[PDB]
Amino acid sequence: PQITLWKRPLVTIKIGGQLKEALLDTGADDTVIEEMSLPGRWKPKMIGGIGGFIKVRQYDQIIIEIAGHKAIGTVLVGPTPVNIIGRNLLTQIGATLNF
Amino acid sequence: PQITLWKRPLVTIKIGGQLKEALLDTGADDTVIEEMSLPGRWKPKMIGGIGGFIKVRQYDQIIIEIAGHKAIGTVLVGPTPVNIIGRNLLTQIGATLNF
Ligand SMILES: CCCC[C@H](NC(=O)[C@H](C)NC(=O)[C@H](CCC(=O)O)NC(=O)[C@H](Cc1ccccc1)NC[C@H](CC(C)C)NC(=O)[C@@H](NC(=O)[C@@H](N)CCCNC(N)=[NH2+])C(C)C)C(N)=O
Ligand SMILES: [Cl-]
Ligand SMILES: [Cl-]
Ligand code: NA
Secondary structure (H helix, E strand, C coil), X not given: CEECCCCXXXXXXXXXXXXXXXXXXXXXXXXXXXXXXXXXXXXXXXXXXXXEEEEEEEEEEEEEEECCEEEEEEEEEXXXXXXXXXXXXXXXXXXXXXX | CXXXXXXXXXXXXXXXXXXXXXXXXXXXXXXXXXXCCCXXXXXXXXXXXXXXXXXXXXXXXXXXXECCEEEEEEEEECCCCCCEECHHHHCCCCCEXXX
């Protein structure tokens, strides 16, 4: 699909059996989701952006469905104000910026 | 052009006759650049990101070139970790996300 940017590029995702809304963020290296449980092992991480840093849990090899497209990758879980799909999974769905 | 996301989508911008690097950010409502001098009056804004809120200076109707494409619009100046081009100017250069 082609998403214009007049409004926030929000899509439905499916992660850990749950449907969530998330923002497609080309300015995000990583994917970060609000607090939830995910299976498997995790390790602590700090991620930063505007306003400074937050502590998250890093889960690897997590499968996710993004607007109907399946991908696998690292998912960070923590007190993010918005669910964000970052470049590590945008690539897997073949997303590009075009102008 | 068409930009894939395996690396950060960094472009050159030109503002106040100076060249700078900036990140195309579909997850940003607004354009935010590091401390610099811009003409005219400014107004206060608070913007939030992953780690909380920062105060910025809002300048309207600023001429800026982005990857060779001319835009004229609002630029926020403040303690951002990286220069970001947000949706307010990505729409002016006709950018879309595609997958
Ligand atoms: C009346 C006026 C109000 C308007 C004002 N609007 C905002 O605050 C809006 C929602 N904020 C945003 O749109 C801001 C950008 C700033 C701006 O646009 O103004 N967006 C953002 O900050 C979005 C995510 C987000 C989106 C919506 C809400 C919250 C967060 N992330 C953009 C941000 C760019 C970064 C490189 C500086 N990316 C990130 O923060 C990601 N970080 C990374 O990718 C890091 N690994 C990069 C390392 C950089 N440096 C370092 N470590 N030293 C993170 C998600 C993993 C408000 N107060 O609501
Ligand atoms: Cl990954
Ligand atoms: Cl590709
Ligand atoms: Na895992």
